Design a protein around this ligand. Structure first.
Ligand SMILES: [Cl-]
Ligand SMILES: [Mg+2]
Ligand SMILES: [Mg+2]
Ligand SMILES: [Mg+2]
Ligand SMILES: [Mg+2]
Lengths: 244, 231, 241, 196, 195, 243, 250, 226, 204
C-alpha cells in the first residue's frame, strides 16, 4: 500500500539525530544572514536580502523583518513561505494572550509557543519540519529587552548578540570580539552593519540589499517604539556609519 | 518474493502469499478430527503441551447449545472468530428466536475472513476451524480456511499429519455415516481416525479432547478421566 | 524511482503517471470524431464487436449524460463508465442547485477539475480516458469541449480522438481552411452526420457497414444516439452521390 | 386547495384551483399548483407551499438522475420517491400530494400520498381543504374509461363546487392532460365555471 | 452561599464572607470558609449555587497555580481578574453555566497598590473601592458611601466593616452565623481570628 | 520496473498489472457458464470433487440476488461472495427508493462501478473473480459477464475459468445454429453438455454439475435451481453426448 | 480506501534541497512566457496563447483571469494547476475577506492567501506542489498599483516589471533597459508587446496574444448606474482588435 | 415596510419605502431596502432587516463566484433556487421575505419568496406590512403590456399607498429599473414627499452652557519616534 | 430578565462640520442597584470610536474581540482600519451569532483619514446597519434620545457648538431614565485631534 512511499520524517538516526531537522538546518545555512544585537537602551535587527534585482520593488518588499506585535519583532532565515505560516500563528497567540489577561504577552511565552509548534513536527504527524530559523527581538516589563533564536528542532536560547543564516560562524566570532555589555543602540547599529559588511558574499553592502529595524525606548517617555527602516533611511545610516 | 510484503498484492501468477503463509500456520498446529453420522456430529482433538510441567492447550470451543468448533493454528485468532460466532448465534436467537443454521454460520465466517485479505494494513487469520452442529436439517460438519473457503463434509482433519486421518475417514465413509443412535461408536471411529496421525506419542488422559452434538445432545466437551473410557 | 509510480514531479518537472494514463486511452483501438453544424453537433465513433458471443446492443462508448449533453469516451470501459456516472450526478446536482441545465463547457470544466485533483493527490490515480462533451448550448450554440487525464480542456470547432487522430485532424483542418468558417454550413443534422462519416472514411481509408459505426447527435433541447437502421439510411445516401 | 387527478380511457388528467392564502388574505390568486416532476409525470400539491415545493424539486432531481441511468421511470417509481420523502420526514412536513402519470405499458395511473406518508393507488383521487365538500359528488359521478371531454367536464364541475364552498379555494381552474399524444394545458376562468 | 463583602483601603484589601451553609431546612455548618488563595498576594471569595461555587473556585486556583509554576512569576491582580471574567463569560453561554459570583482582592507588588475586583456569574467585571454580591450591598453601601476614604488604614477599614456586619445582623432575615475576615497586603494573606 | 508491485499504478504501457494478475486467479478457477435463451437465462458451474468426504449437493456455488437475478463466478470464491453481498445491498437500496426490482443493466453497472473502484487505490486489492450474472426484468432477458478490471458487456453466451476456451467454442456453435433462439429447457440441456465437455481441462478429479435458471414461462421470471428429475435428465443428455 | 497518504511527499534532502519544489520550478521553466509591467497610472500583464491545435478555439481557454474587479492573474507552467488555483483564489477573496469587511481584498493580501495555499501543498500529507508560477497585478485605494510573483514554494515578491517561464532570463534583461518610474500605461503596453515578440516563434497578433490591464475605473463595465461610489472594475482584458491597433504603432 | 415588483414591455421594475422600525419607533428615516444580488438582479426585502441583508449578500457572493466559474452572466432562477433552499433549510427562522427581479440572457423575471422557502411567479407582486395597501393599487391599475414609464408610475403609486396608509411604512420611494439590453438604473430617493418643515425655534446653545468636570487630550496616534 | 436592560446605559453619536461627536453615560447596575459610576462605554481602535450599550459582560467581551481583530487587521494591512470598513466588521461579527446573539447596541463614530468625511453608524444586536447622516442613539433611554436629537440637532455645527448639542441631548435623556446617568463623557473628534470631556450631572 502507501507505506512504500513514506520517507518517515520523524525518526532518529543511529547516532540519535533527527535527519530532517539536520537537513533543514543545512537549508537555512544558505539563507541571507540575519543579525540581532541587544543593548541597554534597545535592540537592533539587521538582515541581508538574497541576490536582488534592480526591477524589484524594494519599498513595498518584505522578506526578512516582520512585526509580531507592537513590542516584538522577528528576523527570518530560511523558507519565507514557511515563516509566514508561523508568523501568523504567533500574531494570533499574542492577541489570544492579550484578550485573556489584558496584558501584552511576555516575550519568552510567545517564543516558547512557536518553538513547541516546531517541536511537534519533529515527533509526530509524519510531515516535514519548517525550514525556518527566527531571531526574536522584543520588550516586556519583566526582563526588559530580550533576544532569542529558535530553529527547526524547536529548541530556543537567549542571546546578547546572535546571527542566523549564512556565515554564522564568521559573524558570531566578529560579534564576540567587539560586543560589550555597556553598549548603546547607536553603537550596536554600527556593529551590526560592520559585521554584515565583512561576512557578506556580495561585492559591496548597499541599501537595496538590506532590511533594518530597531526597538528603542527612544519613544517619548516610558514606552517602546518599533522602527522598520525605509530604503532611504538605510541609505543614510550606511553613509553615517561610513560604509558607503 | 517481491509480492509477499502485504495481503493487498497479487503475484504474477495470481497468488496471495500472505494468505498462503497464514495457511502454513495451520499445518504447524496439532491434529484435530471431525466426523458425523445422521444423528450426531463428533470432534476429536490432540492437545499439545509446552513441556511436562505445562498444561495441554485447549482445542475445542463451544459457540452455542447446538454448535461449536475445534481449532488448529493461532489460538488467539480462533478466540476472535469463535467470539464472532457466539455473537452471531446469539443475535439469531434474540432477534428471530431462531437457532443459527450451521451452513449460514459458515457463510458468515467466510465473509469475515475475506475482508482481511483485500485491504491494506490488516492481516489474514492464522487459524483453521472445524465446526460441528445439529440444526433443523440434522447433523453438520464444516471446515474453515483463513483464505475464506468454507466446505461442508462428512468427515475431515486439519493440522500436522492430518492426511493419515483423512484417508482413514475416506475408507470408512460408508460405515461411520450409518452409526445412528450410538454416540459411543461414533466417538470410537473418531478416536481410531485421529490415531492414524500419531507418531512417537499416544493418546493419554490429559492428551485427548472430545466433543459431541446430536439429536437430543447439547454440545458438550469431554476432557480428563471422561475420555479414559475411549483410550 | 517511485516518482514514476505516484503523481509527484520527476526531475524534469514531468508527471509520468499522467503520461501513462494518456497511453491507456488508446487501449480500445477506437477512433472518434466530432463536428458542428448550424443547429447541431454530431459525434461519431468506431464500433468493434470482436466476439460473436457478445450482445452487440450493449457495446457502446457514447453516453447520454443529460437531456442536452452527450459524451463519447476514448479509453477502457470501466474508467469510461466511472466518468459517465459522475458526469450524470454532477449535471443533475447542478440543475437542482442553480435552477438551469448545466452547460456543456461548465461540465467539461468540472470533470477537468476532478481530473486535475488526481494529478496532484497521491492516493487517487488518473482515469485512463479522454472525454468529449457535445451539446447545442442555449447561449453558445453548438459546442464541443474535450477533457484529458492531465486536467486540460478546451472548446473545439471540430475534433478527433484515438490511435489515428492525426489523420482525421489534418483532414478536418484542410476542409476548414477551404470553407473559412467555424462549422458545417448545413441545415439538417442528417447531412452533418453524412459529412462526418464521409470525412472519417476519407481520413482512415476504410469503408463502414451499419454495425461498424456509432453515432450521437445533439440538437436544441435533446441529445440522442442513432440506431443501426438510421445509420444504414445515412450510408445509403453517401453511396448514392 | 382543491386538487384532483382522474384516470380515463386515453390516460389521466390533473386539476387544481389557483388560490394561495395567508389566513384570510389571498397571497396569490393565479397560482400554478400542477407541477412537473417528469415529462409525463406531474403532481398536485396541497398543504405547506414551502414543503411541497421543496419535495417536488427533490423528486424532479431524483427522477432526472434516474432517467440518465435507467431510462424513463414509471409512475409507481415516482410515487415511491415522493412517499420516501413524506414518510421518513413525517414529523417535520405538512404535505398532501397526488401523483399522476402516463406510461404506454401501464397507461394512466393515480397515486395519493396523504399526511402520514402512506401510498394509495386509485382510479381517481381528491385532496386539499376543498375536497371535503365534493366526496359525495365525485363518488356519484365518477365512471371508469370516460372520454377526454367527459373527464374535463367531471373535473370542471367537481372543482367548481369545491371552489364554491371552500373559502381557501378559488381563482382559475387549471388542468393538465397526460396521454400518448403529449401534454396539454387547459385553463378555465370564473365566468365560465361559476354558471355551471 | 450568602454574604460576601470587600473593601480596598490605603495599603490593603479586606474580604469578609459569611460562615453559614444551609441545606434548605437546617444549617449544616457554621464555620465554612468561602474563599480560595489563588496566589500569595491574591484572594478570591465566592457565592452562588451549591457545588458550582467550590468547583469553580478550585478550578481557577489550579489554573493560576499552574501559571505560577510555568513562568516562575505571580500574575497581577488585574490579569487574574481578566482570566476569571473570561471563564465566566464563556460559561454563561454553555450547556450548564457556572452560577457563581466572586470578589477578587489582590495587592499588586509592581504598582504597590491594593486592588478589588467584583465579577458576577455573567462575566460582568468592575474595579471598585468597595463591593458586594447579592443583597449584601443593599444594606451596606449607604454606610460605605458615607464613611469611606481612600487614605483609610487597615484598622479603620475593619471598623467600617464591623459597622456593615452589624447592620446586616440587624436588618437581614437570615442568620448567616457571622463572617470570616481576611486581609490582603504587601506581606500576603492573613486571617483575622477574632471578629 | 516496480510498476506491478502496487495496485492503481499505470505502467509505461498504460496497463494496470495488478488487475492482470487478478485475471490469473480467475483463469485458475473452475469453469462456469451462462446461456441467454428465448425468455430468460441459464447458469451452470463445474464443482470439483476433491474427496469422497464432500457431501453431495451441499456446497452450493450459484447465488441469488433479490429474487430475479442469478450470479456465478470463477476464481477466488470468497471474493465472489463479497461481490454478491454488495450486489444484494445495491439491489435492496434500489428497490427501497424506486419500488420496482432493479433492472439487470442497472444492476450490472452497480457491480461494475464497485469492481472498478478497487482499481483506483493501492490500499485495496482487485477482485480475483470473473462473474457471470443476469435475469429477467421489464425489458426481457439479460446476460452479463464482469471482469476484475470492472469491464462488463452484455452476452448471448458467456464462459470463464480453466475450461473457458472449450466452452466458448461450444457457445459459438449454438449462436450460429440457432439465430431464431433457444428455449429454456433446451438451454439447460446444452448447459449440462458444455460443462461436461469443458471438464476435459480438469479431467484428473471427477466433478458435480450445478445448474440454475430464470425464465418468464418456466419460472415466472424468478431465479430457481434445477433439481431432481430435470437435473438428472440434463445429466443423461450430457453423458450421452460425450460418448 | 481512505487516503492513507498522511505523510509529506516533499522532504529535505541531505543537501538541504526540497526536491519536489525544485522539480515544480523546472516545470514552470518549460512553460510559455508570461510577463508584467507596472506604470504610474496602471499595470499590464501579458502572455502567448499557445494553441495546442488549430481546430481548438483558443478564446475558450483563458490564461489571463479576473480574480477581483481590481485584480488579475497570469501564469507559466501547468495550465490545469493554474485553473484550480484561480477557482480557490476567487473563493478565498470572498470567504476570508469580502464576507467579513464588505470590500474586496488589497492585492498584497489576496496574494498572501494564494501563497498560503501553495505553501500547504508543499508540506501537507499525500500531495505534490503546484507546478505554476503566478503573476498577479492589482490596484487598491491605500497601496495604489502593484505587481506580485508567486512561486511553487509559496514565496512571493513585488516587482516593478518581470517575466516568468521559457524566455524569462532574456525578457527580464529587455525590461531592465526600458523600465523607468515615469512610464504611462500606453508606454508599458508598448514595451510589453515588444518584449513578448522576442519569445514568440509563429504568428504574433491579437488572436495569439492575451493581454490585460489594471488601469482606470470602467463605469461602462459595471452593469448598473445610480451609486456614485461604485465606478466600475479597473481590470480590463484587451480585445483582439485593440492589440492589433497597437501592433501598427510598434 | 412596503415593497413591490412590476413587469413591463421590455423588463421589470422594483420599488420600496425607506422607513425601518424597532416597534413603534422609527430607527432610520431613509433606509435602503433595494439590495443588489448582481449587476442586473436586484431584490427588495421585508421582515428581519439583518436577515434580508445577510441572505442577499451570501447568495450574491455565491452568484458572483458561480458567474466567474461558468463564464456566464447570472440568472434570476439561480438566485431564486439558492435563496429558497437556504431559507427552507432554516425552517423559517431566517426571517427574510423577498421580491426578486432581474434581467438575464433568458429574459426578464419577477418572483417572490417567503421566509419558509416557498416561491411564486407573477406580473405584479407586493410584500411587507403595507402589501395590502400596495396590492389594492396594483389590482386597480395593472394591465398587460405596460410601458417603462407606466410601470415606474404604477410601482411608485403602490409604494405611496403603503407610505400614507401603513404605519409600518413611510418617508421616500426607492426604485430600480431593469430593462433588457440595458444597464439597471437604481433611482435612490425617486420621490421625496415627506421633508420636515422648518422648526419654530433654533435650539443652538450658548457656549459654556454645559457643566464640565475634566478635560483631556485623547492619544489616537501610535507610539512616537525619538 | 430582559438582557438588554439588566445593566442600563446609553450612547449617542452626532456629525458636524468636519467633525463627529460620541457620548455615553457611566452607570453600571444590577437592575435597581447602582454598582459602578466609572463604567465607560466608548472605546477606540486607532481613530475609529465604538460605543456599546446593553449587557455589560457582552460590552466588555466585544471590546476585547474588536481590539483583537483590529490589531490583526493592522499587522496584515499595514494601516489603521477606517470607520466604513470597521462598520462592516461589526455587522459581520454580530450576525455570525444570529441564533445566540450578543445583547448589545453598538455605535460607530469617526472621520475617514483619506477623504476627511465624517461618519457614524448604529446596529441592532444582530448586525443590521443604520447609517444616518445626522445622529445615532442606543441604550435604555433611546426613546428619550430620539426626542432630544430630533429637536436639538441641526446640520454643519462647529465642533464647540456640537459639544453643547450632544451634551444636552445625553444629559436630559439620561435624567428621564432610571437605569442611565451617574456621570457622562463626551468625545469631540476632528481629523487629527480628539478632546474628551467629563460632564457634571445629578447623581441619582
Ligand atoms: Cl470544481
Ligand atoms: Mg495520484
Ligand atoms: Mg372560494
Ligand atoms: Mg436616571
Ligand atoms: Mg436613584
Amino acid at each position: 500500500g502507501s507505506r512504500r512511499y513514506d520517507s518517515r520524517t520523524t525518526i532518529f538516526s543511529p547516532e540519535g539525530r533527527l535527519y530532517q531537522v539536520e537537513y533543514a538546518l543545512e537549508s537555512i545555512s544558505h539563507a541571507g544572514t540575519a543579525i540581532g544585537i541587544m543593548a541597554s537602551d534597545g535592540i537592533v535587527l539587521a538582515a541581508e536580502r538574497k541576490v536582488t534585482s534592480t526591477l524589484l520593488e524594494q519599498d513595498t518588499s518584505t522578506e526578512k523583518l516582520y512585526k509580531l506585535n507592537d513590542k516584538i519583532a522577528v528576523a527570518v532565515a530560511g523558507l519565507t513561505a514557511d515563516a509566514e505560516i508561523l508568523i501568523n500563528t504567533a500574531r494570533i497567540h499574542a492577541q489570544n494572550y492579550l484578550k485573556t489577561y489584558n496584558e501584552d504577552i511576555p516575550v519568552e511565552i510567545l517564543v516558547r509557543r512557536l518553538s513547541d509548534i516546531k517541536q511537534g513536527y519533529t515527533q509526530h504527524g509524519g510531515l516535514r519540519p519548517f525550514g525556518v530559523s527566527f531571531i526574536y527581538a522584543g520588550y516586556d516589563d519583566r526582563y526588559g529587552y530580550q533576544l532569542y533564536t529558535s530553529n527547526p528542532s524547536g529548541n530556543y536560547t537567549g542571546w546578547k548578540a546572535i546571527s542566523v543564516g549564512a556565515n554564522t560562524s564568521a559573524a558570531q566570532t566578529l560579534l564576540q570580539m567587539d560586543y560589550k555589555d555597556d553598549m548603546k543602540v547607536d553603537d550596536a547599529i554600527e556593529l551590526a552593519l560592520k559585521t554584515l559588511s565583512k561576512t557578506t558574499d556580495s561585492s559591496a553592502l548597499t541599501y537595496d540589499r538590506l532590511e533594518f529595524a530597531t526597538i528603542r525606548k527612544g519613544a517619548n517617555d516610558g514606552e517602546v517604539y518599533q522602527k522598520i527602516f525605509k530604503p532611504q533611511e538605510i541609505k543614510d545610516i550606511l553613509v553615517k556609519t561610513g560604509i558607503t | 518474493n517481491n509480492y509477499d510484503g502485504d495481503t493487498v498484492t497479487f503475484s504474477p501468477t495470481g497468488r496471495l502469499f500472505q494468505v498462503e503463509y497464514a495457511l502454513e500456520a495451520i499445518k504447524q498446529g496439532s491434529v484435530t478430527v471431525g466426523l458425523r453420522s445422521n444423528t450426531h456430529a463428533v470432534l476429536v482433538a490432540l492437545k499439545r503441551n509446552a513441556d511436562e510441567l505445562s498444561s495441554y492447550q485447549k482445542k475445542i470451543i463451544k459457540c452455542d447449545e447446538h454448535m461449536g468448533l475445534s481449532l488448529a493454528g493461532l489460538a488467539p485468532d480462533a478466540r476472535v472468530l469463535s467470539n464472532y460466532l457466539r455473537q452471531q448465534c446469539n443475535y439469531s436467537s434474540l432477534v428471530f428466536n431462531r437457532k443459527l443454521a450451521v451452513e449460514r454460520a459458515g457463510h458468515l465466517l467466510c465473509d469475515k475472513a475475506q475482508k482481511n485479505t483485500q485491504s491494506y494494513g490488516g492481516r489474514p487469520y492464522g487459524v483453521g476451524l472445524l465446526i460441528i452442529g445439529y440444526d433443523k436439517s440434522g447433523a453438520h460438519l464444516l471446515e474453515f480456511q483463513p483464505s475464506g473457503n468454507v466446505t461442508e463434509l462428512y468427515g475431515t482433519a486439519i493440522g500436522a499429519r492430518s492426511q493419515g486421518a483423512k484417508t482413514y475417514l475416506e475408507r470408512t465413509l460408508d460405515t461411520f455415516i450409518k452409526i445412528d443412535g450410538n454416540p459411543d461408536e461414533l466417538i470410537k471411529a473418531g478416536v481410531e481416525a485421529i490415531s492414524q496421525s500419531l507418531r512417537d506419542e499416544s493418546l493419554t488422559v490429559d492428551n485427548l479432547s472430545i466433543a459431541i452434538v446430536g439429536k437430543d445432545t447439547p454440545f458438550t466437551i469431554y476432557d480428563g478421566e471422561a475420555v479414559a473410557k475411549y483410550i | 524511482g517511485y516518482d514514476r509510480h505516484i503523481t509527484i514531479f520527476s526531475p524534469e518537472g514531468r508527471l509520468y503517471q499522467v503520461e501513462y494514463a494518456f497511453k491507456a486511452t488508446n487501449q480500445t483501438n477506437i477512433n472518434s470524431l466530432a463536428v458542428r453544424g448550424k443547429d447541431c453537433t454530431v459525434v461519431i465513433s468506431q464500433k468493434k464487436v470482436p466476439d460473436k458471443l457478445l450482445d452487440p446492443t450493449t457495446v457502446s462508448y457514447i453516453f447520454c449524460i443529460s437531456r442536452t449533453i452527450g459524451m463519447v469516451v476514448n479509453g477502457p470501459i470501466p474508467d469510461a463508465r466511472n466518468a459517465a456516472l459522475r458526469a450524470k450526478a454532477e449535471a443533475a446536482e447542478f440543475r437542482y442547485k442553480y435552477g438551469y441545465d448545466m452547460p456543456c463547457d461548465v461540465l467539461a470544466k468540472r470533470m477537468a477539475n476532478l481530473s486535475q485533483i488526481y494529478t496532484q493527490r497521491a492516493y487517487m490515480r488518473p482515469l485512463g480516458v479522454i472525454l468529449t462533451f457535445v451539446s447545442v448550448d442555449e447561449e453558445l450554440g453548438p459546442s464541443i469541449y474535450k477533457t484529458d487525464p492531465a486536467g486540460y480542456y478546451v472548446g473545439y470547432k471540430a475534433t478527433a480522438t484515438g490511435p489515428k487522430q492525426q489523420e482525421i485532424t489534418t483532414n478536418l483542418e484542410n476542409h476548414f481552411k477551404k470553407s473559412k468558417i467555424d462549422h458545417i454550413n448545413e441545415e439538417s443534422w442528417e447531412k452533418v452526420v453524412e459529412f462526418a462519416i464521409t470525412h472519417m472514411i476519407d481520413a482512415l481509408g476504410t469503408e463502414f457497414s451499419k454495425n461498424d459505426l456509432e453515432v450521437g447527435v445533439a440538437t436544441k433541447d435533446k441529445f440522442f444516439t442513432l440506431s443501426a437502421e438510421n445509420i444504414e439510411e445515412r450510408l445509403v445516401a453517401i453511396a448514392e452521390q | 386547495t382543491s386538487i384532483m387527478a382522474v384516470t380515463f380511457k386515453d390516460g389521466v388528467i390533473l386539476g387544481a384551483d389557483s388560490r394561495t392564502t395567508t389566513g384570510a388574505y389571498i397571497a396569490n390568486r393565479v397560482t400554478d399548483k400542477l407541477t412537473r416532476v417528469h415529462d409525463k409525470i406531474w403532481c398536485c400539491r396541497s398543504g405547506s407551499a414551502a414543503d411541497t415545493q421543496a419535495i417536488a424539486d427533490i423528486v424532479q432531481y431524483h427522477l432526472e438522475l434516474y432517467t440518465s441511468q435507467y431510462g424513463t421511470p414509471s409512475t409507481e417509481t415516482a410515487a415511491s420517491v415522493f412517499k420516501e420523502l413524506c414518510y421518513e420526514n413525517k414529523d417535520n412536513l405538512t404535505a398532501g400530494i397526488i401523483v399522476a402519470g402516463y406510461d404506454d405499458k401501464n397507461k394512466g395511473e393515480v397515486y395519493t400520498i396523504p399526511l402520514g406518508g402512506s401510498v394509495h393507488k386509485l382510479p381517481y383521487a381528491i385532496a386539499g381543504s376543498g375536497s371535503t365538500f365534493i366526496y359525495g359528488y365525485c363518488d356519484k359521478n365518477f365512471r371508469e374509461n370516460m372520454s377526454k371531454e367527459e373527464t374535463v367536464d367531471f373535473i370542471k364541475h367537481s372543482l367548481s363546487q369545491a371552489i364554491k364552498w371552500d373559502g381557501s379555494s378559488g381563482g382559475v381552474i387549471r388542468m393538465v392532460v397526460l396521454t400518448a399524444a403529449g401534454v396539454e394545458r387547459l385553463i378555465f376562468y370564473p365566468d365560465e365555471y361559476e354558471q355551471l | 452561599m450568602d454574604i460576601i463583602l470587600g473593601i480596598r483601603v490605603q495599603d490593603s484589601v479586606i474580604l469578609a464572607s459569611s460562615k453559614a451553609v444551609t441545606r434548605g431546612i437546617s444549617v449544616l455548618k457554621d464555620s465554612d470558609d468561602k474563599t480560595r488563595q489563588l496566589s500569595p498576594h491574591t484572594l478570591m471569595s465566592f457565592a452562588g449555587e451549591a457545588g458550582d461555587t467550590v468547583q469553580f473556585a478550585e478550578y481557577i486556583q489550579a489554573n493560576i497555580q499552574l501559571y505560577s509554576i510555568r513562568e516562575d512569576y505571580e500574575l497581577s491582580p488585574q490579569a487574574v481578574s481578566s482570566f476569571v471574567r473570561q471563564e465566566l463569560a464563556k460559561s454563561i453561554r454553555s450547556r450548564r453555566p457556572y452560577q457563581v459570583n466572586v470578589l477578587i482582592g489582590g495587592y499588586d507588588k509592581k504598582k504597590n497598590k491594593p486592588e478589588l475586583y467584583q465579577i458576577d456569574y455573567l462575566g460582568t467585571k468592575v474595579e471598585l473601592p468597595y463591593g458586594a454580591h447579592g443583597y449584601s450591598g443593599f444594606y451596606t453601601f449607604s454606610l460605605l458611601d458615607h464613611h469611606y476614604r481612600p487614605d483609610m488604614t487597615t484598622e479603620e477599614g475593619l471598623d467600617l466593616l464591623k459597622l456593615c456586619v452589624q447592620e446586616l445582623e440587624k436588618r437581614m432575615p437570615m442568620d448567616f452565623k457571622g463572617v470570616i475576615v481576611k486581609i490582603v497586603d504587601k506581606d500576603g494573606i492573613r486571617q483575622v481570628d477574632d471578629f | 520496473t516496480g510498476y506491478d508491485l502496487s495496485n492503481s499504478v499505470f505502467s509505461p504501457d498504460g496497463r494496470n498489472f495488478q488487475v492482470e494478475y487478478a485475471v490469473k486467479a480467475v483463469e485458475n478457477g473452475t469453469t462456469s457458464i451462462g446461456i441467454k435463451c428465448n425468455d430468460g437465462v441459464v447458469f451452470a458451474v463445474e464443482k470439483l470433487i476433491t474427496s469422497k468426504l464432500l457431501v453431495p449437493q451441499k456446497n452450493v456455488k450459484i447465488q441469488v440476488v433479490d429474487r430475479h437475478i442469478g450470479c456465478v463466478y470463477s476464481g477466488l470464491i470468497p471474493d465472489g461472495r463479497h461481490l454478491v453481498n454488495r450486489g444484494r445491498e445495491e439491489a435492496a437500496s434500489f428497490k427501497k427508493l424506486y419500488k420496482t426490482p432493479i433492472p439487470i443493466p442497472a444492476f450490472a453497472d452497480r457491480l461494475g462501478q464497485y469492481v472498478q473502484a478497487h482499481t483506483l487505490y493501492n490500499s485495496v486489492r482487485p477482485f480475483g473473480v470473473s462473474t457471470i450474472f443476469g435475469g429477467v426484468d421489464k425489458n426481457g432477458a439479460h446476460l452479463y459477464m464482469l471482469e476484475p478490471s470492472g469491464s462488463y458487456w452484455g452476452y448471448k453466451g458467456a464462459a470463464t475459468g480453466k475450461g473457458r476456451q472449450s466452452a466458448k467454442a461450444e457457445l459459438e456453435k449454438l449462436v450460429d445454429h440457432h439465430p431464431e433462439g433457444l428455449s429454456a429447457r433446451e438451454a439447460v440441456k446444452q448447459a449440462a453438455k458444455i460443462i461436461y465437455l469443458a471438464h476435459e481441462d480438469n479431467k484428473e478429479k471427477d466433478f458435480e454439475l450445478e445448474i440454475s435458471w430464470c425464465s418468464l414461462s418456466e419460472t415466472n421470471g424468478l431465479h430457481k435451481f434445477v433439481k431432481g428429475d430435470l437435473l438428472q435428465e440434463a445429466i443423461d443428455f450430457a453423458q450421452k453426448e460425450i460418448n | 480506501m481512505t487516503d492513507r497518504y498522511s505523510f509529506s511527499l516533499t522532504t529535505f534532502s541531505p543537501s538541504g534541497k526540497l526536491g519536489q519544489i525544485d522539480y515544480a520550478l523546472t516545470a514552470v521553466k518549460q512553460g510559455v512566457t508570461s510577463l508584467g509591467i507596472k506604470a504610474t497610472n496602471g499595470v499590464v500583464i501579458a502572455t502567448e496563447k499557445k494553441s495546442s491545435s488549430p481546430l481548438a478555439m483558443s478564446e475558450t481557454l483563458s490564461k489571463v483571469s479576473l480574480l477581483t474587479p481590481d485584480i488579475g492573474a497570469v501564469y507559466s507552467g501547468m495550465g490545469p494547476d493554474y485553473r484550480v488555483l484561480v477557482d480557490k483564489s476567487r473563493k478565498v477573496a470572498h470567504t476570508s475577506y469580502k464576507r467579513i469587511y464588505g470590500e474586496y481584498p488589497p492585492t498584497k493580501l489576496l496574494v498572501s492567501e494564494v501563497a498560503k495555499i501553495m505553501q500547504e501543498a508543499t508540506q501537507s500529507g499525500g500531495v505534490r506542489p503546484f507546478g505554476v508560477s503566478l503573476l498577479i497585478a492589482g490596484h487598491d485605494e491605500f497601496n495604489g498599483f502593484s505587481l506580485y510573483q508567486v512561486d511553487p514554494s509559496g514565496s512571493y515578491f513585488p516587482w516593478k516589471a518581470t517575466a516568468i517561464g521559457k524566455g524569462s532570463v532574456a525578457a527580464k534583461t529587455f525590461l531592465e533597459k526600458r523600465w523607468n518610474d515615469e512610464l504611462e500605461l500606453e508606454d508599458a503596453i508598448h514595451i510589453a508587446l515588444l518584449t513578448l515578440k522576442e519569445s514568440v516563434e509563429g504568428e504574433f497578433n491579437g488572436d495569439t496574444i492575451e493581454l490585460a490591464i489594471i488601469g482606470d475605473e470602467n463605469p461602462d463595465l459595471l452593469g448598473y448606474t445610480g451609486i456614485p461610489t461604485d465606478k466600475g472594475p479597473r481590470f480590463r482584458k484587451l480585445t483582439s482588435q485593440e492589440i492589433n491597433d497597437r501592433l501598427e504603432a510598434l | 415596510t412596503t415593497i413591490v415588483g412590476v413587469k413591463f414591455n421590455n423588463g421589470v421594475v422594483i420599488a420600496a419605502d425607506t422607513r425601518s422600525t424597532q416597534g413603534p419607533i422609527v430607527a432610520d428615516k431613509n433606509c435602503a431596502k433595494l439590495h443588489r444580488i448582481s449587476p442586473k438582479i436586484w431584490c427588495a426585502g421585508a421582515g428581519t432587516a439583518a436577515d434580508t441583508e445577510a441572505v442577499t449578500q451570501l447568495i450574491g457572493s455565491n452568484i458572483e463566484l458561480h458567474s466567474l466559474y461558468t463564464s456566464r452572466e447570472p440568472r434570476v432562477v439561480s438566485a431564486l433556487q439558492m435563496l429558497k433552499q437556504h431559507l427552507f433549510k432554516y425552517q423559517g427562522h431566517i426571517g427574510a421575505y423577498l421580491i426578486v427581479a432581474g434581467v438575464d440572457p433568458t429574459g426578464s423575471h419577477l418572483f417572490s419568496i417567503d421566509a419558509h422557502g416557498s416561491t411564486d411567479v407573477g406580473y405584479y407582486l407586493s410584500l411587507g406590512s403595507g402589501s395590502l395597501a400596495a396590492m389594492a393599487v396594483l389590482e386597480s391599475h395593472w394591465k398587460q403590456d405596460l410601458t417603462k414609464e407606466e410601470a415606474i408610475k404604477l410601482a411608485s403609486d403602490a409604494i405611496q399607498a403603503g407610505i400614507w396608509n401603513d404605519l409600518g411604512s413611510g418617508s421616500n420611494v426607492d426604485v430600480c429599473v431593469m430593462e433588457i439590453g440595458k444597464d439597471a438604473e437604481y433611482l435612490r430617493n425617486y420621490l421625496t414627499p415627506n421633508v420636515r418643515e422648518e422648526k419654530q425655534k433654533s435650539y443652538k446653545f450658548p457656549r459654556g452652557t454645559t457643566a464640565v468636570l475634566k478635560e483631556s487630550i485623547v492619544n489616537i496616534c501610535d507610539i512616537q519616534e525619538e | 430578565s430582559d438582557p438588554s436592560s439588566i445593566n442600563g446605559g446609553i450612547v449617542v453619536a452626532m456629525t458636524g462640520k468636519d467633525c463627529v461627536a460620541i457620548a455615553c453615560d457611566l452607570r453600571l447596575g444590577s437592575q435597581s442597584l447602582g454598582v459602578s459610576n466609572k463604567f465607560e462605554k466608548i472605546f477606540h481602535y486607532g481613530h475609529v470610536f465604538l460605543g456599546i450599550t446593553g449587557l455589560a459582560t457582552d460590552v466588555t467581551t466585544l471590546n476585547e474581540m474588536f481590539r483583537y481583530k483590529t490589531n490583526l487587521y493592522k499587522l496584515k494591512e499595514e494601516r489603521a482600519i477606517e470607520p466604513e470598513t470597521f462598520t462592516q466588521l461589526v455587522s459581520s461579527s454580530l450576525y455570525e451569532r444570529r441564533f445566540g446573539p450578543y445583547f448589545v447596541g453598538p455605535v460607530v463614530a469617526g472621520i475617514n483619514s483619506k477623504s476627511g468625511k465624517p461618519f457614524i453608524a448604529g446596529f441592532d444586536l444582530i448586525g443590521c446597519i443604520d447609517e444616518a447622516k445626522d445622529f445615532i442613539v442606543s441604550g435604555t433611554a433611546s426613546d428619550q434620545l430620539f426626542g432630544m436629537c430630533e429637536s436639538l440637532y441641526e446640520p454643519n455645527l462647529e465642533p464647540e457648538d456640537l459639544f453643547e448639542t450632544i451634551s444636552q441631548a445625553l444629559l436630559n435623556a439620561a435624567d428621564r431614565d432610571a437605569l442611565s446617568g451617574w456621570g457622562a463623557v463626551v468625545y469631540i473628534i476632528k481629523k487629527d485631534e480628539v478632546v474628551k470631556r467629563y460632564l457634571k450631572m445629578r447623581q441619582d
